[PDB]
Amino acid sequence: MENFQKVEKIGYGVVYKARNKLTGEVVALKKIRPSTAIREISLLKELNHPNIVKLLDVIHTENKLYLVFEFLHQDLKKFMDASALTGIPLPLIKSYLFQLLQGLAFCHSHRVLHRDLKPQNLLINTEGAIKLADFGLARAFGVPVVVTLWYRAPEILLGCKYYSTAVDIWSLGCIFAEMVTRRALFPGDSEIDQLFRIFRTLGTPDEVVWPGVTSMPDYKPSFPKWARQDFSKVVPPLDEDGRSLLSQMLHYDPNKRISAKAALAHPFFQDVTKPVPHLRL
Numbered sequence: 001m002e003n004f005q006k007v008e009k010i011g012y013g014v015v016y017k018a019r020n021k022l023t024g025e026v027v028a029l030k031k032i033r034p035s036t037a038i039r040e041i042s043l044l045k046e047l048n049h050p051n052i053v054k055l056l057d058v059i060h061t062e063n064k065l066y067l068v069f070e071f072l073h074q075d076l077k078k079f080m081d082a083s084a085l086t087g088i089p090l091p092l093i094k095s096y097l098f099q100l101l102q103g104l105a106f107c108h109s110h111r112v113l114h115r116d117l118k119p120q121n122l123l124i125n126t127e128g129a130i131k132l133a134d135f136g137l138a139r140a141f142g143v144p145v146v147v148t149l150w151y152r153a154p155e156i157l158l159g160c161k162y163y164s165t166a167v168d169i170w171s172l173g174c175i176f177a178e179m180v181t182r183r184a185l186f187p188g189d190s191e192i193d194q195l196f197r198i199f200r201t202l203g204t205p206d207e208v209v210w211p212g213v214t215s216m217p218d219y220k221p222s223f224p225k226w227a228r229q230d231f232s233k234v235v236p237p238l239d240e241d242g243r244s245l246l247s248q249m250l251h252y253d254p255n256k257r258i259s260a261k262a263a264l265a266h267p268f269f270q271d272v273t274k275p276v277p278h279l280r281l
């Protein structure tokens, strides 16, 4: 809108870096393309957690929904790329994982799922903080509106109609692995290639490890049966505390997969700290 100056595209819709003409505040403006939707979204303006981006305004006008967010200068994807020749230091990996779990524990405690966690638009600042952003909430609310599948939980790929909070733990597990190894864990190019990449690493799931998998909507008895690989190939040289946590985040059965609250108690975080990243802006 004419309410904002210096509108600069930076990435459901387009996201711009903008300056509020009145206040001089620099913000992130998402342009998308419902009474319940407006009220549900607006409830989130009043919720507050250090590891979730602040939602400042909601605006339904024209055929458009604008969401105005606090502005952070970089995301985890850019930082991962910048750090690819050296790797992110393990204390900083650990701090970011811990903070992202704190943010998820909070939104799951309010019965909200992110649904589209990925390194992109996980927002970071110079103070060491990381924040959940770019939620996949339009569909879950009454909002009428190429896809990266690398972080999608297997129950989503198998057509489950009712996601649980466990889908976000899966995605975060994939991000954790990618921070450690500097390569995407499951880089699929289609829904079935995504599924089969998971199966080739973690083994084709069956009723022993995932009760009910063979009744999922898109499950096919014709799926190839791959044996589970050596887990020590997956995230070398991560230590056994880290590998243990990761394996619990990547359990096939959503009922067995670790919760955010329980993950925070895992021994991996006993020595957690909050280091300062080296950011070039």
Ligand SMILES: O=C(O)c1cc(C(F)(F)F)ccc1N[C@@H]1CCc2[nH]c3ccccc3c2C1
Pocket: 010, 011, 015, 017, 027, 028, 029, 030, 053, 069, 070, 071, 072, 073, 074, 075, 078, 121, 123, 133, 134, 135
């Ligand atoms: O800051 C926010 O709130 C924000 C919100 C969302 C969403 F709306 F999707 F939630 C998406 C991205 C957001 N920020 C960008 C993160 C990554 C990045 N890289 C840059 C490189 C040059 C200049 C600016 C940038 C930015 C800013």
Ligand SMILES: O=C(O)c1cc(C(F)(F)F)ccc1N[C@@H]1CCc2[nH]c3ccccc3c2C1
Pocket: 012, 030, 041, 044, 045, 047, 048, 052, 053, 054, 055, 067, 106, 107, 110, 112, 133, 134, 135, 136, 137, 138, 139, 141, 143
């Ligand atoms: O991130 C987006 O793009 C986004 C999009 C939509 C829409 F439905 F409109 F598409 C709605 C919300 C969105 N994000 C919120 C940012 C602030 C915040 N605080 C919370 C506190 C507890 C639980 C969840 C939250 C959220 C999520």
